[PDB]
Design a binder for this molecule. Structure first.
Ligand SMILES: [Cl-]
Ligand SMILES: [Cl-]
Ligand SMILES: [Cl-]
Ligand SMILES: [Cl-]
Ligand SMILES: [Cl-]
Ligand SMILES: [Cl-]
Ligand SMILES: [Cl-]
Ligand SMILES: [Cl-]
Ligand code: NA
Length: 129
């Protein structure tokens, strides 16, 4: 599923991500925009052989099991496939563990490089929320 901007904002809110660990909804929308262009089915191989999965590009190195990332962890206790679903529940539950891990949203390198410090409220502007 390719989400629309306000549509994703509303799903993120429904799943309790808005201001989770202090990060406003526009931060989450911005991270999703630049991680996956809002496409739940996005996947991207890393040079180290891990893979990033879903709307928030969650990495098999730590967070999910794909069976092909030697020595990796599965801290969200889920198959990486569960992160590609049209329903964002698994992605949201895992992102909550990620953003609690110590470095906040800096875990998402595109959030750090493209969202952090910017006018993130633009991302939810005009949305019936
Ligand atoms: Cl957009
Ligand atoms: Cl915001
Ligand atoms: Cl593995
Ligand atoms: Cl493979
Ligand atoms: Cl584990
Ligand atoms: Cl699994
Ligand atoms: Cl959803
Ligand atoms: Cl923080
Ligand atoms: Na893993």
């Amino acid at each position: 599923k390719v989400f629309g901007r306000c549509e994703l904002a509303a799903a993120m809110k429904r799943h309790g991500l808005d201001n989770y660990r202090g990060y406003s909804l526009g931060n989450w929308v911005c991270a999703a925009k630049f991680e996956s262009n809002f496409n739940t089915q996005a996947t991207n191989r890393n040079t180290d052989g891990s893979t990033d999965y879903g709307i928030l590009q969650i990495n098999s190195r730590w967070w999910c099991n794909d069976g092909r990332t030697p020595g990796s962890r599965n801290l969200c206790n889920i198959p990486c496939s569960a992160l590609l679903s049209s329903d964002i529940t698994a992605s949201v539950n895992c992102a909550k563990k990620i953003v609690s891990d110590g470095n906040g949203m800096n875990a998402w390198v595109a959030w750090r490089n493209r969202c952090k410090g910017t006018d993130v409220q633009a991302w939810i502007r005009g949305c019936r929320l």
